[PDB]
Design a binder for this molecule. Structure first.
Ligand SMILES: CC[C@H]1OC(=O)[C@H](C)[C@@H](O)[C@@H](C)C[C@@H](C)C(=O)/C=C/[C@H]1C
Ligand SMILES: CC[C@H]1OC(=O)[C@H](C)[C@@H](O)[C@@H](C)C[C@@H](C)C(=O)/C=C/[C@H]1C
Ligand SMILES: [Mg+2]
Lengths: 277, 280
């Protein structure tokens, strides 16, 4: 495949994921960009992956696609099956990953505004609950804040599946080799250099200073098994969010909670939606 | 074809050449390397591009030190070398990291690459004194090689010809003309610059910007372009190439690029006169 993918493979092999991610972020600055939501080069139409029962005003779930360069429309497929007959589940694309390759957002807010527009159109009058996993969880919260601040529309809730926010990401840094190996393992096709640059650009966005906190209630879903080695004395390795409305612990690790154990995540979401409604 | 080449093209358009070179250098860290001269994946056998008179011996041979340009290679000294035919042997030595046959390993550090060049040159030159010659980045490389030959190989060259060098204390013209320098790289493409070769160029650029000993005892011929490559506001000062304490300075027609492209005979003429002066 491409040179960036080859370099990434080597970086992961040499346990230098973080350093390589910084290269991707810097390199992404030289890709053509969109500087306003209207200038976004791709159709961000959310896809309906599960349907709820017939016979307002029940919340609709919106899956916020994560940053993984091997990811895309397949991210929520396993999870979404458990929502069939329970809740409408829409997956929204992350701008800059589409195909000629898509323009990268100039900044995170520009991407979030593009997403917000597409979601509000698709959702209509139904309340929206945003859901994301890992980096996608961080993106879900940032989107929630933007919706509230700039679109007069705070979501009804946010489901954060294994978030590792700034100040709480030591375990994810320590396990970066596993994260990189997971990306290669999860390839259905070679990760394009264009998507690797998108991934770096969003990683850098999510590491920067962000502008405040959503008023929406949060469900924190945590994996129960560590992805890699962790000394007990070094503290809790688990995902974190400040003062969530509800915490749910599920089987599996950072990865397998969304595969093998996706029904457990779905079960936690469904119960919580009933409680907040 | 390749994303690094696409990015480079955009960086040039946006007048961010320097910034992108830094990205190339950082990215190069993740290419497979050679850490000892012997582990070099390429045959650095110099090519004889011109022959001196059969009449030899004790007479200096010229060694062309290939520069860092990603669009470069064996074609670099073809025009210049014709002017040495029947005057001086001219050997062109490849720069490690640019070859194919699969792509070549990058040097771990500059000294490792210089040691690989040094071994190939000494083998090729035999008993003959060596005068190193390089243009632009290749000129900086010629000096670094000369010092290494002296310090690590007991073999200081008889001389060094630096064609239009811009050393670390005098980089402003290269900075001001960076867009023009990048555009020249795409103009000089015989084929699309490979991502592997762009990374090699970034790696060497970083090497050359870093702490370098260390000063060759060999006498220097500084050859300078007489025309500015791009626009230059007069009060910035002197745009011309520079070297500290050269043995002799020669000015030739053309700019940074055309001095070698259109006026290579004038470069050759300067070298031949100086070689006679330092030998006789
Ligand atoms: C050294 C590995 C990095 O972690 C990531 O790349 C995670 C997986 C990703 O979600 C990215 C999108 C998380 C963001 C916030 C980031 O910059 C992370 C930096 C390191 C913790
Ligand atoms: C923005 C232009 C750059 O200059 C080069 O890349 C020149 C052409 C090259 O010889 C390089 C190999 C010269 C070295 C010293 C370098 O790293 C230069 C960096 C910038 C001044
Ligand atoms: Mg001086």
């Amino acid at each position: 495949a491409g040179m960036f993918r080859a370099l990434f493979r080597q970086a992961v092999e040499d346990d230098r994921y973080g350093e390589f991610l910084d290269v991707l972020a810097e390199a992404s600055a030289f890709r053509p960009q969109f500087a306003s939501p209207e200038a976004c080069s791709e159709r961000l139409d959310p896809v309906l992956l599960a349907g709820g029962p017939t016979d307002e005003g029940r919340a609709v779930l919106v899956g916020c696609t994560g940053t993984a360069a091997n990811g895309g429309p397949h991210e929520f497929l396993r999870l979404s099956t458990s929502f069939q007959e329970e809740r409408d589940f829409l997956a929204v694309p992350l701008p800059g990953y589409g195909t000629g390759t898509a323009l990268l957002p100039a900044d995170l807010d520009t991407a979030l505004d593009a997403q917000a527009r597409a979601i509000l159109r698709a959702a209509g009058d139904a309340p929206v609950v945003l859901l994301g996993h890992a980096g996608g969880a961080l993106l879900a919260h940032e989107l929630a804040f933007r919706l509230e601040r700039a679109h007069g529309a705070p979501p009804a809730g946010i489901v954060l599946v294994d978030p590792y926010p700034p100040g709480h990401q030591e375990p994810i840094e320590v396990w970066s080799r596993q994260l990189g190996e997971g990306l290669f393992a999860g390839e259905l096709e070679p990760m394009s250099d264009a998507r690797l640059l998108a991934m770096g650009r969003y990683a850098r966005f999510l590491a920067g200073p962000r502008p405040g906190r959503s008023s929406a209630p949060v469900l924190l879903v945590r994996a129960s098994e560590p992805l890699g080695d962790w000394q007990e004395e070094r503290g809790d390795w688990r995902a974190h969010w400040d003062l969530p409305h509800t915490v749910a612990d599920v089987p599996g690790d950072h990865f397998t909670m969304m595969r093998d154990h996706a029904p457990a995540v779905a079960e936690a979401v469904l119960s919580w939606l009933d409680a907040i409604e």
